[PDB]
Design a binder for this molecule. Structure first.
Ligand SMILES: [Fe+2]
Ligand SMILES: [Zn+2]
Length: 349
RNA sequence: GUGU
């Protein structure tokens, strides 16, 4: 039993072309796409005003196609899961830092998270690495000045995600920039012939945060974008796949994986417990996470009886299935935090 | 990597 998953590199606002490409493959080969995974640079600009939050060179200050899907003019034909890259409507993603649908069939995984679909556990890490921002908190509501920093990956995602392969393996992990040093684990000589600009970076190319997460979780697959080129490599048991940008040949590939059972997009139980147990570090909605707390210390208080009660209350107030909600994004920010706070306090810890 |  087989499922076919499309994996996409950078989209840069070219959604109609991406779905056209994807519908072609469905018609040409007769295979059915279960769902789509995109590794970032999604540019989910709702309308003109969101352009202030898109950090691009001036020639790329363009709306793209997403507003068509946001308005309902277009309908995304497949469920599309994505992380954020360095070219985003960063204000929208911060409202949805705990994940959410930006429009029908288009689900943002958040700053980081794990989801369940078709028996698979999928971990996403948004953004790109800059050492000088990796300790900065998020400030909310988003203001135009943070356009330059909102999409930089924070070190704290390492502690949020590190326990996630205790119960079971991670099937797929996504990141926008490559895990640092993985460039050396494939045919880099051939890669340097197509991208001679990479050679000077050596093994330091890529994000150290993603390197750590890769080494800790060892997913079956790690997918990244951002470098506008195809690449493959193997780090121990992990198959690494880098993808190009929509418009070129190397932008889309497909994973044909065993389908254990067909199952709708669901929240991951272990992620949900991590989210509830770290609530104290996130409780100040003007600035989070409060790193005076230890994320690891907070997560060390997880127990099997608390996990069971957390998932019971999550199913009650939110539900295990991830379902489309068309409230505005600032309301979704407040609502999801309202139930995390409520669930935590009901634990009396 | 259209990366500061
Ligand atoms: Fe990028
Ligand atoms: Zn890109």
């Amino acid at each position: 039993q087989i499922q076919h998953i499309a994996i996409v590199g950078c989209v840069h606002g070219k959604y109609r072309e991406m779905y056209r490409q994807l519908s072609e493959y469905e018609k040409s080969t007769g295979k059915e796409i279960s769902f789509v995974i995109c590794t970032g640079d999604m540019q989910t600009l709702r309308y003109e005003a969101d352009l202030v939050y898109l950090k691009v060179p001036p020639k790329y200050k363009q709306m793209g196609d997403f507003h068509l899907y946001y308005e309902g003019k277009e309908k995304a034909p497949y469920l599309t899961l994505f992380i954020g890259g360095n070219h985003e409507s960063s204000n929208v993603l911060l409202h949805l830092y705990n994940g959410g649908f930006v429009c029908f069939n288009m689900y943002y995984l958040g700053v980081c998270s794990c989801i369940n679909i078709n028996g698979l556990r999928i971990v996403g890490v948004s953004g790109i690495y800059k050492s000088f921002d990796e300790k900065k908190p998020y400030t909310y509501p988003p203001s135009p000045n943070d356009v330059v920093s909102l999409f930089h990956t924070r070190n704290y995602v390492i502690q949020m995600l590190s326990n996630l392969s205790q119960s079971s393996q991670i099937d797929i992990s996504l990141s926008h920039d490559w895990p640092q040093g993985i460039v050396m684990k494939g045919n880099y000589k051939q890669l340097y012939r197509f991208q001679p600009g990479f050679k000077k970076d050596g093994a330091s190319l890529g994000s150290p945060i993603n390197k750590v997460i890769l080494n800790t979780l060892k997913p079956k697959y790690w997918i990244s974008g951002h470098m506008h080129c195809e690449y493959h490599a193997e780090e121990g048991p992990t198959h690494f796949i880098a993808l190009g940008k929509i418009g070129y040949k190397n932008a889309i590939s497909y994973l044909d994986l065993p389908l254990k059972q067909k199952t709708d997009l669901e929240y991951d139980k272990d992620w949900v417990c991590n989210l509830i147990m770290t609530w104290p570090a996130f409780s100040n909605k003007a600035q989070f996470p409060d790193l005076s707390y230890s994320i690891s210390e907070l997560l060390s208080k997880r127990t099997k009886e608390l996990d069971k009660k957390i998932i019971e209350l999550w199913e009650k107030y939110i539900g295990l299935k991830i379902i489309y909600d068309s409230d505005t994004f600032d309301i979704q920010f407040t609502s999801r935090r309202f139930y995390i706070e409520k669930i935590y306090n009901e634990l009396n810890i």
